[PDB]
Design a protein around this motif. Sequence first.
Motif, short mmCIF file in Angstrom:
data_model
loop_
_atom_site.label_atom_id
_atom_site.label_comp_id
_atom_site.label_asym_id
_atom_site.label_seq_id
_atom_site.Cartn_x
_atom_site.Cartn_y
_atom_site.Cartn_z
N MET A 67 -1.86 6.42 -2.03
CA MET A 67 -1.72 6.95 -0.48
C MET A 67 -1.64 6.13 0.39
SD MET A 67 -4.90 9.62 -0.64
CE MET A 67 -4.33 10.93 -2.39
N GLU A 68 -1.03 6.40 1.84
CA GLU A 68 -0.99 4.88 2.71
C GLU A 68 -1.22 6.07 3.88
OE1 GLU A 68 2.35 3.06 3.01
OE2 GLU A 68 1.04 1.08 1.96
N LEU A 69 -2.53 5.64 4.96
CA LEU A 69 -3.10 7.00 5.24
C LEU A 69 -2.92 5.91 6.64
CD1 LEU A 69 -4.29 9.98 7.01
CD2 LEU A 69 -6.29 8.73 5.72
N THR A 70 -2.45 5.89 7.47
CA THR A 70 -2.35 5.33 9.12
C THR A 70 -2.54 6.28 10.44
OG1 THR A 70 -0.52 4.35 8.87
CG2 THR A 70 -0.86 4.40 10.92
N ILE A 71 -4.02 5.49 10.95
CA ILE A 71 -4.74 6.74 12.21
C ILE A 71 -5.20 6.06 13.25
CG2 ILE A 71 -7.12 7.30 12.03
CD1 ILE A 71 -7.49 7.68 8.99
N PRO A 72 -4.36 5.93 14.21
CA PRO A 72 -4.46 5.63 15.47
C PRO A 72 -6.03 5.01 15.75
CG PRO A 72 -4.31 7.35 16.44
CD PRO A 72 -4.47 7.85 14.26
N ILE A 73 -6.54 3.83 16.61
CA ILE A 73 -7.75 3.64 16.97
C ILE A 73 -8.48 4.54 18.14
CG2 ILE A 73 -6.79 1.20 16.21
CD1 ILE A 73 -6.70 0.69 19.71
N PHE A 74 -7.20 6.01 18.50
CA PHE A 74 -7.98 6.54 19.54
C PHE A 74 -8.16 7.66 18.68
CE2 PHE A 74 -4.15 4.12 20.98
CZ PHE A 74 -4.97 3.08 22.12
N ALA A 75 -8.54 7.58 17.62
CA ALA A 75 -8.91 8.91 16.98
C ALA A 75 -10.33 9.40 17.01
CB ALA A 75 -7.89 8.84 15.12
N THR A 76 -11.20 10.05 17.27
CA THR A 76 -12.49 10.15 17.67
C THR A 76 -12.57 10.30 15.68
OG1 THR A 76 -12.31 12.66 17.82
CG2 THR A 76 -12.09 11.32 19.67
N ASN A 77 -14.43 10.41 16.05
CA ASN A 77 -14.55 11.28 14.16
C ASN A 77 -14.77 12.74 14.09
OD1 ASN A 77 -16.47 9.14 13.63
ND2 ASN A 77 -17.72 9.69 14.11
N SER A 78 -14.37 13.87 14.85
CA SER A 78 -13.47 15.12 14.72
C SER A 78 -12.63 15.30 14.97
CB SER A 78 -14.47 15.66 16.15
OG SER A 78 -13.56 15.35 16.94
N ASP A 79 -11.73 14.07 14.77
CA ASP A 79 -10.19 14.08 14.53
C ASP A 79 -10.42 13.28 13.55
OD1 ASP A 79 -8.92 14.42 17.25
OD2 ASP A 79 -8.70 12.63 17.97
N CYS A 80 -11.13 12.50 12.86
CA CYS A 80 -10.56 12.44 11.62
C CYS A 80 -11.55 12.90 10.27
CB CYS A 80 -11.18 11.22 11.31
SG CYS A 80 -11.06 9.54 12.06
N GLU A 81 -12.16 13.98 10.75
CA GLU A 81 -12.82 15.26 9.47
C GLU A 81 -11.32 15.90 9.68
OE1 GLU A 81 -15.71 16.68 11.91
OE2 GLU A 81 -17.17 14.82 11.36
N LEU A 82 -10.41 15.73 10.79
CA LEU A 82 -9.19 16.85 10.59
C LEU A 82 -8.37 16.31 9.93
CD1 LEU A 82 -9.47 19.65 12.26
CD2 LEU A 82 -7.62 18.40 14.36
N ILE A 83 -8.25 15.38 9.38
CA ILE A 83 -7.30 14.53 8.75
C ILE A 83 -8.09 14.73 6.67
CG2 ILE A 83 -6.52 12.67 7.96
CD1 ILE A 83 -6.52 11.10 10.78
N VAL A 84 -9.14 14.66 6.58
CA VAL A 84 -9.73 14.88 6.24
C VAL A 84 -9.56 16.14 5.48
CG1 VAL A 84 -11.89 15.30 4.29
CG2 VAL A 84 -11.82 13.12 6.41
N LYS A 85 -9.74 16.81 6.22
CA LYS A 85 -9.67 18.86 5.73
C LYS A 85 -8.62 18.38 5.43
CE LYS A 85 -13.50 20.88 8.36
NZ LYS A 85 -13.21 21.55 6.69
N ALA A 86 -7.55 18.30 6.07
CA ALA A 86 -6.21 18.86 5.79
C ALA A 86 -5.80 18.25 4.31
CB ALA A 86 -5.06 17.56 6.60
N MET A 87 -6.52 16.69 3.92
CA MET A 87 -5.83 16.10 2.93
C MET A 87 -6.86 17.17 1.74
SD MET A 87 -6.16 12.19 3.19
CE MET A 87 -7.45 12.26 3.98
N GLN A 88 -8.05 18.12 1.66
CA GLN A 88 -8.45 19.02 0.77
C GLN A 88 -7.87 19.78 0.63
OE1 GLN A 88 -12.21 19.34 2.85
NE2 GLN A 88 -12.98 17.22 1.59
N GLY A 89 -7.12 20.09 1.72
CA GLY A 89 -5.99 21.66 1.59
C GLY A 89 -5.10 21.28 0.83
#
Lengths: 129, 129, 129, 129, 129, 129
Positions: free
Chosen positions: A88-110
């Motif tokens: 898996m490769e995950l590309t995240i823009p540098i403008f993503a805050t911590n709450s934005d990243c938590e959103l990515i982790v939850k999506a991957m878990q769901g």
Amino acid sequence: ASNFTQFVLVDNGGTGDVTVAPSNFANGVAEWISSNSRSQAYKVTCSVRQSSAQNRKYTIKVEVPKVATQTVGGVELPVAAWRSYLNMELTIPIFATNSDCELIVKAMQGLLKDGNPIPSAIAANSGIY
Amino acid sequence: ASNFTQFVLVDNGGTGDVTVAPSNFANGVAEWISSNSRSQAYKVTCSVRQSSAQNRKYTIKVEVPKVATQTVGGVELPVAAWRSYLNMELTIPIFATNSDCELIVKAMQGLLKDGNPIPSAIAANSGIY
Amino acid sequence: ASNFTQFVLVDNGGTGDVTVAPSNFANGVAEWISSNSRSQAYKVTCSVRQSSAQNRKYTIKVEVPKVATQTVGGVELPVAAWRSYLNMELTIPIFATNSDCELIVKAMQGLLKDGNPIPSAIAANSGIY
Amino acid sequence: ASNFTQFVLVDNGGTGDVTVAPSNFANGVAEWISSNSRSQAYKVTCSVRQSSAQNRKYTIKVEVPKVATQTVGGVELPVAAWRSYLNMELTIPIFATNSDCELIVKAMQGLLKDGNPIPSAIAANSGIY
Amino acid sequence: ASNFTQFVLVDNGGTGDVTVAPSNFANGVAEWISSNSRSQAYKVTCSVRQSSAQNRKYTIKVEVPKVATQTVGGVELPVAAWRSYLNMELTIPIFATNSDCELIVKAMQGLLKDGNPIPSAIAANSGIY
Amino acid sequence: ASNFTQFVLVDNGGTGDVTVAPSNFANGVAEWISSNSRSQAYKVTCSVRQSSAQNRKYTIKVEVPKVATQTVGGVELPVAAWRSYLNMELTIPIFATNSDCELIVKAMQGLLKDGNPIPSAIAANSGIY
RNA sequence: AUGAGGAUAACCCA
RNA sequence: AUGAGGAUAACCCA
RNA sequence: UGAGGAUAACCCA
RNA sequence: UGAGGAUAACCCA
């Protein structure tokens, strides 16, 4: 702190639980392996890179082995009948805050939660229909 | 046994959950999207194929929007600044049974469970250390 | 004796301080970042190496965000307009003892103490005069 | 006003205190040296340049000498066994207000404060771990 | 977790102990150094690599310096009169389990235990007889 | 006097101990072997030589076998599935006194003492991290 | 312009 | 950089 | 590969 | 000399 710790990769309620431990960080690639001969071990690697001016890219890989005992030259060696690979490769823009990243982790878990479409298809050797 | 149904991608305990619904099936590639404009939607696509004589390969892709300071329904450029992309490739040898496959799914769920190294690193804009 | 711990980078007397925490250790390059998106974070990295037969060299880098008129968590371009970059290179002959090294550190602290020429010039958008 | 003044580079509580005084401004490079033979003196230089359309770049250098007395040709000359060099470049966008610059100075002071990671490693001849 | 930490290389009761601390981990080579002058410091480096299809290989190195003071022109520097160089390579088939590795380690510790042939020959400037 | 004697290579309490005994000292190379089948035996060899005008050099080698039974044509022989190979070279200037050699030996024993970085990495099929 | 490039240090290298 | 490209998996291909 | 050398993550057959 | 390989007192640059 230090997040480079061991963890349970496969959980079977504390019995036959595949736990993976830190084992190498050479070349900026964090590695984890299970207590096994390097030939039958589960392997997990992860690395982060500044893939672009405005991007960061995590590259995670998991190797799930089908353990077997081969007989090469009339001698028994612990080996892997085959391996399954997750890439898996995950590309995240540098403008993503911590709450934005938590959103990515939850999506991957769901995405992989029991009963949801994708993990059901994979587990039943079928496609989505 | 139709498994191409809607599901919860982001779970916030009932309130503020993100549901992703079937939206396209062109070329055997199943697609699910949230109820947003396509520039701000959560997108999930999945396909399987015989990558070779020995393996089958699931290709799963997820797109997660940057939410902080977002303007619902607005035009936000550059697009690469407001979206994260997940790209998973699961290679499974043709010898894997439904059981072997359930174990692989468990391995993926374990990799991303809360509190574990990888998801903790991602959620905090960090690498391993 | 682990010295890779979090610390206060910007001190505003307890209230509104900026703490920078360990976030990466890939390739022996220690990294610390504040709790922001990486586009708006305070970043600090440090590495040491034998630059040559005669010297060792510490390479310290700091990134400080432009705060005035900042939109917390927003997309702010061009990136070069919203960030300052510090780049330090400390060359120390292999003959320096712990003592010689404490003196060098004192020299660096003195250079930047409040009220002194260099920091006063920087803080007022000026040169020397 | 005039910020081109002498100051204490190394402080040992008013005794054995290395003070540095203005000594040259030829070619837009401000220079400071200690009361010593030009061969054993501590040296500090600083210069500001409009490195780009939207950038200003300060270039600061410090030279810490290990004083010794050599015997060339059977005669005693004051010299430096070796020198330690600090090379820092600071790039600041022209959009940075005074309060933004004060933020940069504080970061640099906190970075080198006693007890913090970086100055501890330097003073103990080690790396970050 | 981390095994790239500081440790006692030479044990002389509690005092006289030679401790080595992390200094660099570049290109897959971990490096430890003792405090004070790099010139009179003890050095230890370690690295692992897949030397072939079936073998992994460790390369460990140790340097024991003979602390001394060099005087030239009346200028004296802390140097090492000479250095002693240890240099080992350990090859381990991938079929080795953790139990086998524990045996390999015991084998090495036994080889060097006090009173045994080899450590005694070395300590007495002698060979076998 | 004689140091070309039998000794415990692997210590497992009192029972399970692997003892190696003298077997050959031809052409300046001392050799120890464990009892029973030469094919499944542990081997240790040692030798010293004047590698140059100022250096003497020890070359030590250890072989740890993975005991196993090979069956071919229904005929079975006691063999070693594989072997692990230790290989060290120690260089010591002729200026080293017996005291310096005792330090060199302590340095080696410290390097491999239980719980330290290196012996732990090896015992866990891991590298540094 | 960039370098966790070098230096013998307002210089030199890619 | 992109690939519902491949792999024998920190590699290779267009 | 080396009971090949070294000023030691280099170099030689 | 080699964080060069090995089936290990051999072999390669």
